[PDB]
Amino acid sequence: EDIIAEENIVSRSEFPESWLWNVEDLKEPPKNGISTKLMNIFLKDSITTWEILAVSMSDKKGICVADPFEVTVMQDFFIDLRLPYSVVRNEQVEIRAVLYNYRQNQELKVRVELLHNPAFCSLATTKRRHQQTVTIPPKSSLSVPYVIVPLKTGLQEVEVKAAVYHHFISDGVRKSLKVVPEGIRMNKTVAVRTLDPERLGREGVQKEDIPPADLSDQVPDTESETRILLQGTPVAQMTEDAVDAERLKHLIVTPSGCGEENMIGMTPTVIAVHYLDETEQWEKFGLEKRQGALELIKKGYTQQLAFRQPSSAFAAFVKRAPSTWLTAYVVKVFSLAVNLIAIDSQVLCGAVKWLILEKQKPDGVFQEDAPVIHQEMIGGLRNNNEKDMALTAFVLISLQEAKDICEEQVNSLPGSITKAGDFLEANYMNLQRSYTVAIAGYALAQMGRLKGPLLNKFLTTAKDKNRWEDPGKQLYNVEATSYALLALLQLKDFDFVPPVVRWLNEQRYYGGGYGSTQATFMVFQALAQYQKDAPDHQELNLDVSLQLPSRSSKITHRIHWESASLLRSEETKENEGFTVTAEGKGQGTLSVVTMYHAKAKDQLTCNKFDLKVTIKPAPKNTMILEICTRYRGDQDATMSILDISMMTGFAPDTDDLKQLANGVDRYISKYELDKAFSDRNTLIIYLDKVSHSEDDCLAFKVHQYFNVELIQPGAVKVYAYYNLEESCTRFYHPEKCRDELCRCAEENCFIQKSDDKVTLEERLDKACEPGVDYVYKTRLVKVQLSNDFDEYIMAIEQTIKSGSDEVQVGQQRTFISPIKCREALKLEEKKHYLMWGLSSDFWGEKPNLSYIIGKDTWVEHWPEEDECQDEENQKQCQDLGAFTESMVVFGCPN
Amino acid sequence: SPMYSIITPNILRLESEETMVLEAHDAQGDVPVTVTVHDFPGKKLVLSSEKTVLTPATNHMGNVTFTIPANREKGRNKFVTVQATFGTQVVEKVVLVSLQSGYLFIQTDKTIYTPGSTVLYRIFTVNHKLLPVGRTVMVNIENPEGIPVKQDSLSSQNQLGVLPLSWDIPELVNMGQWKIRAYYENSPQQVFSTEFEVKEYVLPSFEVIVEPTEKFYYIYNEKGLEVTITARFLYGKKVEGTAFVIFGIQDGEQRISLPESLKRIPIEDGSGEVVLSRKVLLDGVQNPRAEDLVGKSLYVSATVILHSGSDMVQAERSGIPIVTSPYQIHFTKTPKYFKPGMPFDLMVFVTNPDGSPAYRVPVAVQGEDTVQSLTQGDGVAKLSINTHPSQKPLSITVRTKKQELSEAEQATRTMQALPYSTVGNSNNYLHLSVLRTELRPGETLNVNFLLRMDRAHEAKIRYYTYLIMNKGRLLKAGRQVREPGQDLVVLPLSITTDFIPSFRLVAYYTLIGASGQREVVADSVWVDVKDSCVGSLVVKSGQSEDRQPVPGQQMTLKIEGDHGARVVLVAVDKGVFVLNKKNKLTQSKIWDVVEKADIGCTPGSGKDYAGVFSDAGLTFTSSSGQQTAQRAELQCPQP
Amino acid sequence: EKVLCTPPPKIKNGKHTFSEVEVFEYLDAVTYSCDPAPGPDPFSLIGESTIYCGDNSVWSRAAPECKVVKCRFPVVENGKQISGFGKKFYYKATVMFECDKGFYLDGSDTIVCDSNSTWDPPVPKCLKV
Ligand SMILES: *[C@@H]1O[C@H](CO)[C@@H](O[C@@H]2O[C@H](CO)[C@@H](O[C@@H]3O[C@H](CO)[C@@H](O)[C@H](O)[C@@H]3O)[C@H](O)[C@H]2NC(C)=O)[C@H](O)[C@H]1NC(C)=O
Numbered sequence A: 001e002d003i004i005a006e007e008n009i010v011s012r013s014e015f016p017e018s019w020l021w022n023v024e025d026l027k028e029p030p031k032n033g034i035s036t037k038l039m040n041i042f043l044k045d046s047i048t049t050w051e052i053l054a055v056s057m058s059d060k061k062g063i064c065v066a067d068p069f070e071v072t073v074m075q076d077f078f079i080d081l082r083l084p085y086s087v088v089r090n091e092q093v094e095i096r097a098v099l100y101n102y103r104q105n106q107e108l109k110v111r112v113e114l115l116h117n118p119a120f121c122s123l124a125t126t127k128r129r130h131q132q133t134v135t136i137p138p139k140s141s142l143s144v145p146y147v148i149v150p151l152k153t154g155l156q157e158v159e160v161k162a163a164v165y166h167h168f169i170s171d172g173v174r175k176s177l178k179v180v181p182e183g184i185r186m187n188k189t190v191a192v193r194t195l196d197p198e199r200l201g202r203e204g205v206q207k208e209d210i211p212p213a214d215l216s217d218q219v220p221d222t223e224s225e226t227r228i229l230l231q232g233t234p235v236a237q238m239t240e241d242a243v244d245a246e247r248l249k250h251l252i253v254t255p256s257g258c259g260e261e262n263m264i265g266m267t268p269t270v271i272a273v274h275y276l277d278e279t280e281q282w283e284k285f286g287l288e289k290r291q292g293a294l295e296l297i298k299k300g301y302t303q304q305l306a307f308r309q310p311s312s313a314f315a316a317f318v319k320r321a322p323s324t325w326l327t328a329y330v331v332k333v334f335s336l337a338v339n340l341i342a343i344d345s346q347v348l349c350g351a352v353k354w355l356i357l358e359k360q361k362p363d364g365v366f367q368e369d370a371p372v373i374h375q376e377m378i379g380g381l382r383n384n385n386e387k388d389m390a391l392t393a394f395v396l397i398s399l400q401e402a403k404d405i406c407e408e409q410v411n412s413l414p415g416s417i418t419k420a421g422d423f424l425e426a427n428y429m430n431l432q433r434s435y436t437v438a439i440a441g442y443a444l445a446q447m448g449r450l451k452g453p454l455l456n457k458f459l460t461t462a463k464d465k466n467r468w469e470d471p472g473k474q475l476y477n478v479e480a481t482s483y484a485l486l487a488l489l490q491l492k493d494f495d496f497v498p499p500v501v502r503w504l505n506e507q508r509y510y511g512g513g514y515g516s517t518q519a520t521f522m523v524f525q526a527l528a529q530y531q532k533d534a535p536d537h538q539e540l541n542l543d544v545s546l547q548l549p550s551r552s553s554k555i556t557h558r559i560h561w562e563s564a565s566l567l568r569s570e571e572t573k574e575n576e577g578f579t580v581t582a583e584g585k586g587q588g589t590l591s592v593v594t595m596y597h598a599k600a601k602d603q604l605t606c607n608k609f610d611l612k613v614t615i616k617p618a619p620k621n622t623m624i625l626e627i628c629t630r631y632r633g634d635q636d637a638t639m640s641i642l643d644i645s646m647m648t649g650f651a652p653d654t655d656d657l658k659q660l661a662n663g664v665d666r667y668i669s670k671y672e673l674d675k676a677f678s679d680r681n682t683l684i685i686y687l688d689k690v691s692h693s694e695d696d697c698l699a700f701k702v703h704q705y706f707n708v709e710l711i712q713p714g715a716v717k718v719y720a721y722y723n724l725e726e727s728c729t730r731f732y733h734p735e736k737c738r739d740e741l742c743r744c745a746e747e748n749c750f751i752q753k754s755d756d757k758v759t760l761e762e763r764l765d766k767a768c769e770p771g772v773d774y775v776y777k778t779r780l781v782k783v784q785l786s787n788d789f790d791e792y793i794m795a796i797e798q799t800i801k802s803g804s805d806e807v808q809v810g811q812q813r814t815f816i817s818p819i820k821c822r823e824a825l826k827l828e829e830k831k832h833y834l835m836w837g838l839s840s841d842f843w844g845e846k847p848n849l850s851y852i853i854g855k856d857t858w859v860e861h862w863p864e865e866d867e868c869q870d871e872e873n874q875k876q877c878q879d880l881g882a883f884t885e886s887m888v889v890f891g892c893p894n
Numbered sequence B: 001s002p003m004y005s006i007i008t009p010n011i012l013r014l015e016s017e018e019t020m021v022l023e024a025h026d027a028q029g030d031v032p033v034t035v036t037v038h039d040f041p042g043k044k045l046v047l048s049s050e051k052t053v054l055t056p057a058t059n060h061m062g063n064v065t066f067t068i069p070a071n072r073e074k075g076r077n078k079f080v081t082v083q084a085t086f087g088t089q090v091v092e093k094v095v096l097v098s099l100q101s102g103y104l105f106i107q108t109d110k111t112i113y114t115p116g117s118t119v120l121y122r123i124f125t126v127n128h129k130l131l132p133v134g135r136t137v138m139v140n141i142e143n144p145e146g147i148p149v150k151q152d153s154l155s156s157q158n159q160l161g162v163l164p165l166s167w168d169i170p171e172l173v174n175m176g177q178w179k180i181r182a183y184y185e186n187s188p189q190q191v192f193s194t195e196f197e198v199k200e201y202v203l204p205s206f207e208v209i210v211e212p213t214e215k216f217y218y219i220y221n222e223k224g225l226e227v228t229i230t231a232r233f234l235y236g237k238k239v240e241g242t243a244f245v246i247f248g249i250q251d252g253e254q255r256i257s258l259p260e261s262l263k264r265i266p267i268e269d270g271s272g273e274v275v276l277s278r279k280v281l282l283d284g285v286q287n288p289r290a291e292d293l294v295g296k297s298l299y300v301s302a303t304v305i306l307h308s309g310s311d312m313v314q315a316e317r318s319g320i321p322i323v324t325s326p327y328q329i330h331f332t333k334t335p336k337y338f339k340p341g342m343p344f345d346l347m348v349f350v351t352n353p354d355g356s357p358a359y360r361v362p363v364a365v366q367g368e369d370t371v372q373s374l375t376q377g378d379g380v381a382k383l384s385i386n387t388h389p390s391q392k393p394l395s396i397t398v399r400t401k402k403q404e405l406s407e408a409e410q411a412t413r414t415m416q417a418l419p420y421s422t423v424g425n426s427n428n429y430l431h432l433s434v435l436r437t438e439l440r441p442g443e444t445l446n447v448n449f450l451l452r453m454d455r456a457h458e459a460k461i462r463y464y465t466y467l468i469m470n471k472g473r474l475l476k477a478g479r480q481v482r483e484p485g486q487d488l489v490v491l492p493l494s495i496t497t498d499f500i501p502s503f504r505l506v507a508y509y510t511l512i513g514a515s516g517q518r519e520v521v522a523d524s525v526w527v528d529v530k531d532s533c534v535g536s537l538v539v540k541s542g543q544s545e546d547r548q549p550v551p552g553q554q555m556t557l558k559i560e561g562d563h564g565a566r567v568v569l570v571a572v573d574k575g576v577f578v579l580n581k582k583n584k585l586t587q588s589k590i591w592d593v594v595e596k597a598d599i600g601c602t603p604g605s606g607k608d609y610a611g612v613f614s615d616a617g618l619t620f621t622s623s624s625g626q627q628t629a630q631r632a633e634l635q636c637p638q639p
Numbered sequence C: 001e002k003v004l005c006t007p008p009p010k011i012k013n014g015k016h017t018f019s020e021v022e023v024f025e026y027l028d029a030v031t032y033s034c035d036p037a038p039g040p041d042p043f044s045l046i047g048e049s050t051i052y053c054g055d056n057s058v059w060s061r062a063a064p065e066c067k068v069v070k071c072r073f074p075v076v077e078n079g080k081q082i083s084g085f086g087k088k089f090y091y092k093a094t095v096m097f098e099c100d101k102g103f104y105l106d107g108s109d110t111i112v113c114d115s116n117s118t119w120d121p122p123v124p125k126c127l128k129v
């Protein structure tokens, strides 16, 4: 017909924002290392420019990001169909299809069509096909407005087609449109609970019960989502600061003297290096200083060997009888120095063997037969009444230190250790001095033999739970408390530790000086061990399970310190109460939040602008269009835009426009004044300001140039330039709802029937379809209004057919309906109705179950008894009576 | 009399090839060498052990390569002891360790997404040489509050450096800037990130470009700020419509709109012109004194609407500096040390106010107007000056000399250079001279070694040792021979693709007393190499014209790269970039990341020989006691 | 069409990351570690700690092992340790030795602790020159 038909047009539909997500390899042998790959691909339907980015990864060249390659995909004739991100159900909107003619020397006569879709009321129906014919000048564009009303939510579809007469030219566009329910996206915080099974649960089990969300103001027939969030609460434990490296400089000393004094000098340097290694303080101390310190340790060791007697024991002089204590102290120092320098095993293990064979008595006691000359170097052992216990503990501690080094070389070692342990064990309770309780406490704890009353004695011997002390030299109390700290670490009694370490550090003892040997060695051994063993954080191992009534199987998650911040999420479409169970170590958080669509109380459109549009016949068809807008602000609006679309077959007066364009506060494009080709159907008037104190009004005339049955309403849209979303749209059309578009949108309000074509047999047939769950006689008690919904409160006068809802006679039920349906239903208070519907019409839950009046709901006016007396109401009244009697007495067939 | 020496980088990385240069100066016969790397300070581990032999054939110069395995934090620095035994003699050095094991780069298919859509992304796993590697990686997705919502552990083994991944964006979600954060699981403290925006949007149909006539505003320009607006459909056609333009001032993070600068203008044939008048700008602020605006910037917002009223697009141009001069001078490429009596080379970097390199700008040393030059494509001009043999510091002032400008509008800058301190005031120096043009792989750089010492000892210097640092590691080491009397020798250095994006050349010699003591003399230079890829990648049309193509039509894509390479692709609608053009992956950003991680800190030379080594990112240690000072700092020192 | 893996194997005295996961994707990785031990000596981890789901729907490697490994104190007459100083020697503990003057080495100068708590190679001797 000089045209291409609508059945023979394939609409463009492929519009990804990104594609070509492919991995390919270059295997073609190259020219100078450069391989050239040829690949075939299919350009999508979009009319735009693509950016193709390539990235390569070579085993020898590495990574290379190519420069972008642009490919422009273009046509000379096409439709540009631009839709909003979303539109609201049951709200009349105007979409625009813009037709483009980029041909240089050719005018186009085009027939454009919008396809019918049951999801939208439009001028095109299942049998009536909205088609227009328009003429597009060369190198120009043209907009085609379509007023529609979306009916159901979800991803719907809009498709418009076009073709030029006399040439083989067409184009179609098929895009999806997002339809959303009425109301506002809301969420409610249902629960926020602290998870801590250790503290909040019975025998370490915390069960938490969660209620459903209220959702009383929920929009009928909409989805909700309950979100369940779990997260861990990581807690750090504070570790006391290390002793600053600078404080230890004075401990790096040169060892000199004989058997005893050489060890006095060796002590501070060994323990200082040990402490600096553990706390990682060499960088700050001076990295290159460590080697000199090692050499001094080596020298101390080498010099000590000159006082090793043939028996492998030690004394101040080679002619002096060997000391039990000194020999045990050498083992103590050398065993720790094994981590620092090459120590001869045979020297160390020889000393151990000698202690065991020569100096351990049959009751397990170690005994001194030749006291050291430097009595000040033995710390709290000096003048200690509890001589056998303190020395045995001291020697036993040295043996434990050497145990792994001397394991294969001294077979008598484990039995000696056990024997010494037995003696300490049997005599511990009788101890009176805090020093001995501390040192023997440590010795027994190394063996796992400090329990019950002995453990209790050890702990309660501390004063203020932070120190072990006796009257006398304060250096002895520092030494003792250091032994006790080591015992505490051995027992892993970490909750008792912090006050003890605080007391020690508070003494500001940094070693060195006369009689400082044991205090210096022990304080830094204890504090080093503390840094090595103290935990940085609370343990976090939470096992969390939830049971939703909607499901059968537990959903279980574990919370860890490692991923404590990680947000575990679970979602359900059901609005159900449920349970959460928590087990294990540590703390966490549970939050429950339900997202839903809530009914609105006030208008959600035109919140920044007020827009009244009027259209009245003028005193060759002619009407005058008046537009009144006010800004809703504390200040006048800045530069704003009036986007106006004409009613079908209308065009603005010219000389009227020119008078507005000469207006000082307004502006009209010279473009939209140099036209006269049905392109005059859309118009933009630019406003410098929009007053906020009052209405800003303007008016002009419009001339009908084209007659047609289907006159589409015109539209006016107002907004400020900086915010397109803060707009307001009003539609306009002539009068003297009706007709055609209102009508098509009213169809799903309820079952439409022309009164006096409804028969008795017909009602009995339809009311008895399975699926029809309720049949009531109602009385409208009250009409109630919301922004988008009317709520009809019905008194139930008769339960003709009962379903799921066990409503009783005299009780009330609420029937909700879209505001668009108000005139169609024409319900009046105090009047009676026959109503029936499906199980799909139910909403909410007992005793808050509600009814939706939908497309399958029967709603019929039941005449009052006084009206029924009139001859002209007799048929309907009697039919209703016979209908009711039949349904109650015999029920639906079968 | 033999002196044994070892040279390694200043900072050693984990799981990266490292080289250790070994020299036996004045050695006879074969010298066995054992190189061991231990943990500091415990020596519990043998991190490395390698053997080699120094022979007269190799001129008693060799190397060993070693790799330090994955460690085992509180952020305290780790150290190793590097040790070399030459025959019986031990030379050792404690060296700082970086816990980084390479780079991760992240590419998203788009810059912006709607809820419901799927983020397609790729993680490229490379080492410090930007070569593909197979390792275990941890990946986190983060919401605009910084909370992780998704977490995965993946291996990139046998994947040729590419980890393909996806994440589904829920319909119900928080809008704004989301993040992808990834780390090698052996090096958890170096996290690599990228962002993507989540927003409810529709794709625009055209693009708008806002561009001022100058990339700055001169505060005494009575013409004000002139701006050109350009509108163009995504398919190439020009736009007819209307533009709304408004200006503002930026002062720190404070933005001050200028309401009186709001103009509405026609867009005809895709173009519009709009001016911010000087009077409006000055009346828009409270500070009467115009000079107080200097240091602040201007921004411009343009909103274009089609005549059909069918689409609207906003675009902004910010960071337009209010200045007194169109230029700024930087000495960030010039060594801060010189050798008295020898030429001193000035690399003067001139930029436009936005920070881009200025081109063909005349610069000149103030006081020596004779010494002038012309800035090149990279904004660098080279000025060589002759120095006196005094210890007096070099104060140098450079000015621009654009004849088109007035004197008040010329840029100026002053720097100071200190004399390189010789050993025991011996006045012995080494000076490296080099060419500074656009340097590209495949070419040869002539390195000039200029000696300056006493004639009584000059014959002792029979060679120089040189080292090339690149991408934070030792690329090559070598020897440049010298005959008696050769006070200048040339090294033909072949520039391969391994020199990208830059390198440092350190050279030194050593000799005996002259009072019996060992003297070490060093110098260094830093050289820029033209940015590209090591290989190459190009995408173009496999046609045959047939453009412009049509919706649905097949097309041929020509991909020219390097053999055996794996190529990954993506096609994106330009409208997306009209919405968001941030966080995109480019090669220059990669090289930027690499150059940030450089362990050398200065453009060259040094306070003394040890300074020369350390500033270049090297340790030096000899058996006779000469060595670099300890470096404890992962980062380069600050102003 | 898409390669999946059943969960990694469980091990005696050990565990692995993502233990609350039943279906594993392609390239999905998992890291093993040992439980704390009751005795004075901790468990050593033998083998690779990290395995992933690659081709063929199998795990790249066999799962590692968690057991007590403890070699005896190495003693070299007329020799000295120069590395690996310590009292205890667990899996992969490495010790270097160096003979005293007037003595030469008979064996490797470097020894490592086996998975069967044996030195490999055996402890060297220092012999009279
Ligand atoms: C659950 O519902 C509440 C109430 O709507 C939500 O809180 C609100 O969230 C919105 C969206 O992020 C916030 O609006 C924004 O405010 C910031 C300034 O705070 C502004 O920069 C943005 O342009 C936007 O206007 C709002 O702050 C916040 N209000 C309150 C009272 O918290 C909440 O986000 C919802 N939860 C979820 C999961 O969506």
Ligand SMILES: *[C@@H]1O[C@H](CO)[C@@H](O[C@@H]2O[C@H](CO)[C@@H](O)[C@H](O)[C@H]2NC(C)=O)[C@H](O)[C@H]1NC(C)=O
Pocket (backbone or CB within 6 Å): B019, B062, B063, B064, B474, B475, B476, B477, B478
């Ligand atoms: C370390 O030494 C080795 C051997 O001398 C160098 O490796 C070779 O260097 C020669 C040039 O002398 C090249 O021809 C070979 O291609 C290199 N082979 C390898 C295995 O790469 C290496 O360059 C040296 N590294 C330095 C100097 O930093």
